[PDB]
Amino acid sequence: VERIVSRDIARGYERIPIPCVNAVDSEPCPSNYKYVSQNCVTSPMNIDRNITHLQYCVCIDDCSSSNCMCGQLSMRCWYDKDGRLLPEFNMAEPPLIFECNHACSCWRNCRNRVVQNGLRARLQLYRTRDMGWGVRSLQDIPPGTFVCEYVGELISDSEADVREEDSYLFDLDNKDGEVYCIDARFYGNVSRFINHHCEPNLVPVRVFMAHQDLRFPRIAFFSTRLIEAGEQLGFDYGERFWDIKGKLFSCRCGSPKCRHS
Amino acid sequence: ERIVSRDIARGYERIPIPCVNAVDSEPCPSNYKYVSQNCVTSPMNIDRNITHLQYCVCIDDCSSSNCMCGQLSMRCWYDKDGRLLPEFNMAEPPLIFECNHACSCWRNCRNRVVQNGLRARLQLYRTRDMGWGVRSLQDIPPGTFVCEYVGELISDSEADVREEDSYLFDLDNGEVYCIDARFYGNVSRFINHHCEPNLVPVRVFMAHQDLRFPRIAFFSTRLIEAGEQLGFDYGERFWDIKGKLFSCRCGSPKCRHS
């Protein structure tokens, strides 16, 4: 029998509830963390929030023309009229996405705004058979759809080096020497439960919205294909994770093209 | 009469805020940037450490006296409709600590009003004697959250060197700060002074509890009828300065500055 152990792990902080079910064992809904819907900090992170440092567009339309400055910063605006990535979007090597911000002349409903509108897909936390907790979609998700953001505690590399648990870190790539990461161990959203898959249906993309401090991109997961209702979400953890954890366990994603077992 | 803007906020508020001018030929104001939340130019080291937040451990709707956030606010002053209780001291308002993301309660608990944003149907309009003003297009019951005074967070040192001081809101306290809505602000930058105000500003804390930076929320002091202009008491610092230049045009029989 499938036990509903939570009607909403986000307790109303998302646009829709995220229930938790367990049809496997007697484990209750996870509670060793604090759910937050947006990134937080403990030690200060001096994000550049000077409004005059934002690059912005002066579009007089819905930011669907070639002249949009924010589209140019993203090479081009990759969103279609429904907010989904165009098929030309390179998911093997995603570019930086600069969404429109509060300094732009455009309206809040312009085309170049997707991730800033929050989680919309109906997801469900559930107990897997051999990978702990996982996240599944309760609905069909078309390809190129924004699913969720990897939310957690913004910490420096120096802080990440003294944390005992490293299984919930997401490294923030930046050309500058200073490096940071998102730790979802103590504070995080639904994305902290997404398991690794070697042929993933999700791809992380670095996105900038209210600020453009390149040290702190926000991590948005987009669907790489049609995700059918009931299917578990997964993304590629990368080589750093498996270089560390491979000596502890092999990958259990079950793909015929598994690269870590 | 003459609609000069369908929405001065460009969709950043829950409701459009149109602008009309039935008085003269002035177009919609455009010498500023509309922002729906406070911004900064020079950095402000607001304490955003999540472990520094006081929070409640309520298992209900935060309607009991055990709610930590209510105790910080002396008590929770919101009724089930989100309006201030009749016991609220409009003459000397307390600090309001709304529930935050560190609390164990849900996003729809009783102690959350200002963080839900502007809801009332407002309208920017041209007055006959004091430039632009804001009016309500609907009846607003007493104790209702109307709007927040939004703008650029600046220090006292910065405020003392700004040529235009007509859009400052002082955040009183050693180090003191203020909100300058001259270059960046929301609809509240157009609210005029009235000696019989129907709005009262209240200092509110939500996502952070850095007492240097309270957010300014306007609540109705009485039933505001549809079509009535919004107004609050600018205070004596404003009128000690600007009284040398002009007199108050609020038109009240109890006007104190004309």
Ligand SMILES: COc1cc2c(cc1OCCCN1CCCC1)N=C(C1CCCCC1)CN=C2NC1CCN(C(C)C)CC1
């Ligand atoms: C100098 O001071 C400011 C500098 C900037 C401002 C505003 C400023 O205030 C001026 C105050 C003057 N007072 C006017 C009345 C009395 C005094 N505008 C912003 C944003 C504009 C859009 C809305 C959000 C703010 C961007 N950054 C800024 N300079 C860049 C703008 C774009 N150029 C070009 C290369 C394209 C690069 C430098």
Ligand SMILES: COc1cc2c(cc1OCCCN1CCCC1)N=C(C1CCCCC1)CN=C2NC1CCN(C(C)C)CC1
């Ligand atoms: C095990 O998987 C990772 C492990 C580490 C990572 C990243 C990892 O997976 C990222 C992808 C998987 N995610 C899973 C959920 C979401 C994606 N990050 C780094 C740097 C962090 C800061 C930014 C630059 C890279 C540090 N080293 C790590 N663990 C060490 C921490 C300190 N301990 C002891 C010294 C106490 C030794 C191991």
Ligand SMILES: COc1cc2c(cc1OCCCN1CCCC1)N=C(C1CCCCC1)CN=C2NC1CCN(C(C)C)CC1
């Ligand atoms: C009114 O009394 C309750 C009202 C609600 C409760 C519990 C309640 O009991 C309190 C008394 C209990 N007795 C006291 C003695 C013994 C038990 N529960 C919550 C949560 C439900 C999910 C699990 C955590 C608590 C949400 N719904 C509630 N109404 C809200 C709906 C939204 N409004 C706003 C729009 C203003 C805020 C009130």
Ligand SMILES: COc1cc2c(cc1OCCCN1CCCC1)N=C(C1CCCCC1)CN=C2NC1CCN(C(C)C)CC1
């Ligand atoms: C004119 O009305 C005010 C004038 C001033 C205020 C506040 C005021 O109105 C507040 C209420 C009215 N609002 C209107 C919209 C919303 C409420 N605040 C202060 C301090 C700011 C923060 C630290 C403590 C107080 C600075 N001095 C002030 N003007 C000077 C600035 C520097 N210039 C230079 C030329 C030298 C000389 C005049």
Ligand SMILES: Nc1ncnc2c1ncn2[C@@H]1O[C@H](CSCC[C@H](N)C(=O)O)[C@@H](O)[C@H]1O
């Ligand atoms: N493909 C995979 N194969 C084996 N274990 C995996 C896996 N993907 C994720 N995991 C497990 O999940 C951790 C990532 S955190 C992901 C959520 C986790 N399943 C939970 O219940 O909290 C990894 O450290 C590993 O222990």
Ligand SMILES: Nc1ncnc2c1ncn2[C@@H]1O[C@H](CSCC[C@H](N)C(=O)O)[C@@H](O)[C@H]1O
């Ligand atoms: N009660 C009042 N009497 C006369 N002028 C007033 C007033 N209340 C506000 N004002 C004018 O408005 C300024 C405050 S900013 C308020 C908006 C302003 N009416 C505008 O059109 O931009 C004051 O400096 C004063 O010039």
Ligand SMILES: [Zn+2]
């Ligand atoms: Zn644009």
Ligand SMILES: [Zn+2]
């Ligand atoms: Zn833009």
Ligand SMILES: [Zn+2]
């Ligand atoms: Zn735009």
Ligand SMILES: [Zn+2]
């Ligand atoms: Zn695998």
Ligand SMILES: [Zn+2]
């Ligand atoms: Zn509470």
Ligand SMILES: [Zn+2]
């Ligand atoms: Zn609460």
Ligand SMILES: [Zn+2]
């Ligand atoms: Zn609380």
Ligand SMILES: [Zn+2]
């Ligand atoms: Zn008056």
